[PDB]
Amino acid sequence: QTSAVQQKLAALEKSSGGRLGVALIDTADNTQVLYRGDERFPMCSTSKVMAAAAVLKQSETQKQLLNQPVEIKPADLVNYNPIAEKHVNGTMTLAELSAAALQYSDNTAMNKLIAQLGGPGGVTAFARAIGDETFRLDRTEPTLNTAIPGDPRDTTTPRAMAQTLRQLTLGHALGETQRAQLVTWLKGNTTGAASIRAGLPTSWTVGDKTGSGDYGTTNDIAVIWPQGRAPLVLVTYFTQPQQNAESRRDVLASAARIIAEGL
Numbered sequence: 001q002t003s004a005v006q007q008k009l010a011a012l013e014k015s016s017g018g019r020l021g022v023a024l025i026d027t028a029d030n031t032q033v034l035y036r037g038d039e040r041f042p043m044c045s046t047s048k049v050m051a052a053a054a055v056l057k058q059s060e061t062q063k064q065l066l067n068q069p070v071e072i073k074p075a076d077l078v079n080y081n082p083i084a085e086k087h088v089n090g091t092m093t094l095a096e097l098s099a100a101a102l103q104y105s106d107n108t109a110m111n112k113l114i115a116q117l118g119g120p121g122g123v124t125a126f127a128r129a130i131g132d133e134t135f136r137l138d139r140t141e142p143t144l145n146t147a148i149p150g151d152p153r154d155t156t157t158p159r160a161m162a163q164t165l166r167q168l169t170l171g172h173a174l175g176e177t178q179r180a181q182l183v184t185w186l187k188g189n190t191t192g193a194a195s196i197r198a199g200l201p202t203s204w205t206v207g208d209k210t211g212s213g214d215y216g217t218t219n220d221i222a223v224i225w226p227q228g229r230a231p232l233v234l235v236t237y238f239t240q241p242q243q244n245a246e247s248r249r250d251v252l253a254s255a256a257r258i259i260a261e262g263l
Ligand SMILES: *C(=O)N1C[C@H](NOS(=O)(=O)O)CC[C@H]1C(N)=O
Pocket: 043, 044, 045, 046, 079, 080, 104, 105, 106, 107, 142, 145, 191, 209, 210, 211, 212, 213, 214
């Protein structure tokens, strides 16, 4: 019941001063490694994968949805808007908003995705439609990042997020073109090199989405293509007891290294 990898993650967690959640799926054999795999964690920016995937699903039944313009007004800007601020009083397409949300983690872009789905509950509804009974999105940006201990809003579990990420990127939750677009976007992420990627050999290819929030919450969810192996799906969630705790991306890298060394 407690594997060697689980014992190592427990030792990492003990030295980290926070709470660590890990779910690995190895698609070479569909085996799973779970650490606090059924405990809820605040998703923060990693929830953007579900919102972008839901808009990709919408695009399966709409000619050129991704080219549809969305107006960006000054009042739409929130706390972190590296792409959207360039387009205030103009428009961005849903493809541009999806890329900005995933690759630059633009929070104004994420709010446009949420609105395109009918609000946070529309993102949750998409999760349910692809078999994820755990994910819940409750708020918009930026308050979905409050990451308060014990608060179920805007949370999921590592087990559920790993299974969902596998279905979206490697399975058939999306159509073929849409799945390929999602993987292309994730592989072009700009924010991930200090997190899961840092713990892996340079030769392994990664597409990922990071997140962070209050309580020193530090997250990453990744699809990994190891050299000479079938892909892996890896979720590393981390959160700490005090609201102003510092980020700990090194803990995510350490967890990824333990997983890689255990394969
Ligand atoms: C998402 O977690 N956020 C938006 C942006 N994400 O960048 S990260 O993925 O590199 O952390 C800034 C942090 C965070 C937020 N609190 O809005």
